[PDB]
Design a protein around this nucleic acid. Structure first.
Lengths: 116, 126, 82, 100, 98, 153, 126
RNA sequence: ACUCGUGAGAGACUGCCGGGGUCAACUCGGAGGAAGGUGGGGAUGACGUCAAGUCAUCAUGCCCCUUAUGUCCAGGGCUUCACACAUGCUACAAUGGCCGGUACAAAGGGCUGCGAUGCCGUGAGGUGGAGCGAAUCCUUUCAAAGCCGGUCUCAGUUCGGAUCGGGGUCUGCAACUCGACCCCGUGAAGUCGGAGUCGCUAGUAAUCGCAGAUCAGCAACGCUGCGGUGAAUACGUUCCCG
């Protein structure tokens, strides 16, 4: 079922299917399912249309997900970069920003290993 | 071959000379070299007649080869270390050409530890 | 970060300095030495010469960097590459 | 270690007993209850005005004679090096080598 | 009213000697006892490195063992009390009177 | 083992089947000391085999063992400073050990979505003589035969 | 009455045997609420099986220390001792079965320099 | 009465029997016994070697500094990163992940310390302070693996948790460089690892949790101990090492 432009998994339990929304993990899905009132164990092929609508308007109401969240994160990172703070140039040169050791580790920020 | 040199104190140019001299030993080794480390140290006491100490360690396909030398300067220590390493690698070869004279030969002439024991019948030859 | 009950932390030296600085609405460069002090909305226009370990680097405050520390804007270690 | 640093540790202790006993503790009691009016009281600022050496956070358990700052034992106030030597000489009552 | 007599010493023979001598004197004064009830031994263990520099793998262990005996009397006649505060004991053993 | 053979551990008979070999099997499938899970897996496999065939599980398990039990195995021997593959006769205990180890491993590499079903299928196919352990016994016997020239030492 | 004890690697079992039925009372819980493992039950009842006195002794037991396996072993030793106290002339049958022997296998003390009792830290020659 | 705690003592000595043995050492088997052949594990490390390590625990000959190489302070650094090596932890999953219920330890620590009941938070935690110098009170009455039930269905996934964004708690004068923990979101590599190489013979390896020292806080996945569950294999010294 198309939910906020997200093609839901074909057969999954409700909360874990909702996890596939970029702004929702497991706790968010659980609490929104409990609050709105849908069953949490029922498969994604059992949704009726009005269920899709109630999920849609609830999510657009008291949550921010998908493109807006991505662009807000990108804008926050860019603003942090442009003010010249430590995390700024840490983001600029692709190095860990939370004080992680860089003598050996931090291949996640460094990407794949290169030989020079 | 790639070598990392861990010197100490003051030894200008010792690292490069040791690198270039040791890297030439790869062809002498009959098996691929997995690691090669060299350390240069100098004795603080001026009373030492040979203050500079050079040590090397090569991982010749799991077989550890090491040597240690003393000299009056970096160049002499590196050269003597190269000589000792060459001698050790010569004694380690273990390929067939290096162990063809030690394999037991003949049938009854000569005995070695691993020589094939003579087959004996049950009854005394008589 | 610092707990909310204690409130933000600012050293008294540059505190009195900025209070006497903004009382006559003129903002000259202030030479400072407490990199641990948070940015307060009273700094919005003042220019700080925050220490680095060797010298003082000018820091011109804005609305964006309020709530941070003067220390984030004086990078200590210098690295250019291998 | 160094005589100056052995002495300076003691000077911190006499500073601590003089200041941290009531001055650097009543301010903490003020800051604990959110009900207590800390913000206008400047108990934070008043306690900043106090010397750093008042704070016990600057103290260091050194060896009581040797001055060794590391490998310290709170039961004896002695370094690991000194405890080993005096226990072997039978100087600490009721201490001996172990087996089990 | 009964009072607790508590012994703590690092040496077994010393605390046993004090316990027997104390029951002897209180029985001399004519008091009812319970006997030197044994209590669990307290063990404090410390591990140290032998060498001053490096050599972490070589360690040395020590303990301090404290032995406890419990003495409880009855019928606290004043003569027993006056005897109790008039007892000389080895410095190793302490007494707790409650 | 330089000073002589070491004594063997006399493991106990199983309570719910009364056979030594099922205990040997549970000890072979044991991992990290989780013995309860190992016995559950083995018992489930035996019950699955009983349900599929309709007879006692111990008899078909023994049939599988005899189907995968090897007799001739090859060890490298250095005689007179030269090494060759020499076929060697296998003692009964070692043959049982090898058979059980092969069964357990080759069941671990099956594709039946659960260890119990994999093990049950492997024992059934070994009983009928189609399992991969039976194959492995075929290859080890083939290698033993192909090197029969070196059997004289 | 009669009372014996069983000990197995930090597990202590006090047993009280009376000639009633085969009811097993382990700290107020039955042999099924306790010890939910068939192997443990067989280990428990083995002395009764070899003595063939199954279901003729009501058993009351006190369990403390160790885990389920140690508790079961100590309990089995406890019933063996209780049986040897009740009917002395069965001592051959229990003893040759080993049920009269306390198992002196305890956790080996951890040693300094080693990660575990015998496990040694990984050593790199290169 | 039974455990238990801690004092004393007994108990393994080839003591006995049978056989090999030079009738000698010693050895094989059996009985008794909790234990049988230095029972298991510790402490204990000969003469010396390697001018091995330590003038940075300490002491010390000689040399050197002494308006400084002494001494006080603030800030920074010891945490820098294109890489290389080494020791570990977490994984790559179904012998598993998640949720609910539920059973069993030992050892140790605690006075300006342990800190309970209760109340407030979702959770770090906050308020509050019962009782404890402690076989008593607190560390929960102590565990986790375990057992039972439900769900997931072989996928880079309900695996894996890195990295990153936001929001907080605590300690501390102060968490920017540079603490730990909590919540929401984010969801990387990783499909069992080449040459080569390491540890371990029984309560051992493997696996699970607990505690202590240092310590205001912690970089602790480290070290030193404690208990829970608990294997496989050893034909035999030709080869490798000492």
């Amino acid at each position: 079922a198309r939910l906020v432009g997200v093609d839901l998994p074909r057969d999954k339990r409700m909360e874990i299917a909702l996890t596939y929304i970029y702004g929702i993990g497991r706790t968010r899905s659980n609490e929104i399912l409990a609050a709105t009132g849908i069953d949490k164990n029922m498969r994604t092929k059992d949704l009726t249309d009005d269920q899709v609508t109630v999920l849609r308007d609830y999510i657009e109401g008291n949550l921010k997900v998908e493109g807006d969240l991505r662009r807000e994160v990108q804008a926050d990172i860019r603003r942090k970069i442009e003010i010249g703070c430590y995390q700024g140039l840490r983001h600029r040169r692709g190095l860990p920003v939370r004080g992680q050791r860089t003598k050996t580790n931090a291949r996640t920020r460094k990407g794949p290993k290169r030989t020079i | 071959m790639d070598v990392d040199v861990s010197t100490d104190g003051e030894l200008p140019g010792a690292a490069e000379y040791a690198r270039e001299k040791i890297g030439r030993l790869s062809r002498r080794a009959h098996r691929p070299v997995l690691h090669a480390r060299v350390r240069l140290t100098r004795h603080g006491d001026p009373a030492v007649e040979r203050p500079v100490i050079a040590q090397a360690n090569l991982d010749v396909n799991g077989r550890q080869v090491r040597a240690q030398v003393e000299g009056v300067n970096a160049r002499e220590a590196v050269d003597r270390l190269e000589a000792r390493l060459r001698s050790r690698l010569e004694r380690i070869a273990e390929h067939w050409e290096a162990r063809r004279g030690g394999v037991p030969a003949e049938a009854g002439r000569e005995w070695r530890h691993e020589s094939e024991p003579a087959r004996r019948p049950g009854y005394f030859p008589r | 970060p610092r707990s909310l009950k204690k409130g933000p932390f600012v050293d008294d030296h540059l505190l009195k300095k900025v209070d006497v600085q903004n009382e006559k609405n003129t903002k000259q460069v202030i030479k400072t030495w407490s990199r641990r002090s948070t940015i307060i909305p009273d700094f919005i226009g003042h220019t700080f010469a925050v220490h680095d370990g060797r010298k003082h680097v000018p820091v011109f405050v804005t609305e964006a960097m309020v709530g941070h520390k003067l220390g984030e804007f004086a990078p200590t270690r210098t690295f250019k590459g291998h | 270690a160094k005589k100056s640093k052995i002495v300076k540790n003691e000077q911190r202790r006499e500073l601590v007993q003089r200041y941290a006993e009531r001055r650097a503790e009543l301010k903490r009691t003020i800051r604990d209850p959110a009900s207590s009016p800390e913000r206008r009281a400047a108990a934070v600022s008043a306690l900043q005005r106090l010397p750093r050496d008042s704070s016990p956070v600057r103290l260091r358990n050194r060896d009581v004679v040797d001055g060794r700052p590391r490998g310290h034992l709170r039961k004896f106030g002695l370094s690991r090096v000194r405890v080993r030597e005096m226990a072997h000489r039978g100087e600490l009552p009721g201490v001996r080598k172990a087996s089990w | 009213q009964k009072i607790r007599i508590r012994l703590k010493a690092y040496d077994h023979e010393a605390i046993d000697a004090s316990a027997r001598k104390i029951v002897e004197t209180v029985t001399r004064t004519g008091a009812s006892v319970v006997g030197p009830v044994p209590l669990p031994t307290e063990k404090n263990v410390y591990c140290v490195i032998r060498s001053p520099h490096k050599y972490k793998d070589s360690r040395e262990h020590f303990e301090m063992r404290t032995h406890k005996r419990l003495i409880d009397i009855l019928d606290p006649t004043p003569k027993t009390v006056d005897a109790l505060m008039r007892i000389d004991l080895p410095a190793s053993v302490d007494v707790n009177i409650q | 083992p330089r000073k002589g053979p070491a004594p063997k551990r006399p493991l106990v008979n199983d309570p719910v089947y009364g056979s030594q070999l099922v205990t040997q099997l549970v000890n072979k499938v044991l991992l990290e000391g989780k013995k309860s899970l190992a016995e559950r897996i083995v018992y489930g496999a035996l019950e699955q085999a009983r349900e599929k065939t309709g007879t006692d599980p111990v008899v078909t398990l023994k049939r599988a063992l005899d189907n995968v039990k090897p007799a001739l195995e090859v060890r490298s021997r250095r005689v007179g400073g030269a090494t060759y593959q020499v076929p060697v006769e296998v003692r009964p205990d070692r043959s049982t050990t090898l058979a059980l180890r092969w069964l357990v491993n080759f069941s671990r590499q099956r594709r039946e979505k659960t260890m119990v079903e994999r093990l049950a299928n492997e024992i059934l196919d070994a009983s009928n003589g189609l399992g991969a352990s039976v194959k492995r016994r075929e290859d080890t016997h083939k290698m033993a035969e192909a090197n029969r020239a070196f059997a004289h030492y | 009455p009669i009372q014996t004890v069983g000990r197995r690697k930090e597990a202590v079992v006090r047993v009280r045997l009376v000639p009633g039925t085969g009811q097993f009372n382990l700290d107020g819980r039955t042999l099924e609420n306790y010890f939910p493992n068939k192997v443990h039950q067989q280990l428990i009842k083995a002395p009764l099986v070899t003595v063939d006195r199954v279901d003729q002794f009501d058993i009351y037991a006190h369990l403390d220390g160790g885990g389920p396996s140690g508790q079961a072993g100590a309990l089995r030793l406890a019933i063996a001792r209780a049986l040897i106290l009740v009917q002395p002339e069965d001592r051959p049958a229990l003893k040759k079965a080993g049920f009269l022997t306390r198992d002196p296998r305890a956790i080996e003390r951890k040693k300094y320099g080693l990660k575990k009792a015998r496990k040694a830290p990984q050593y790199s020659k290169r």
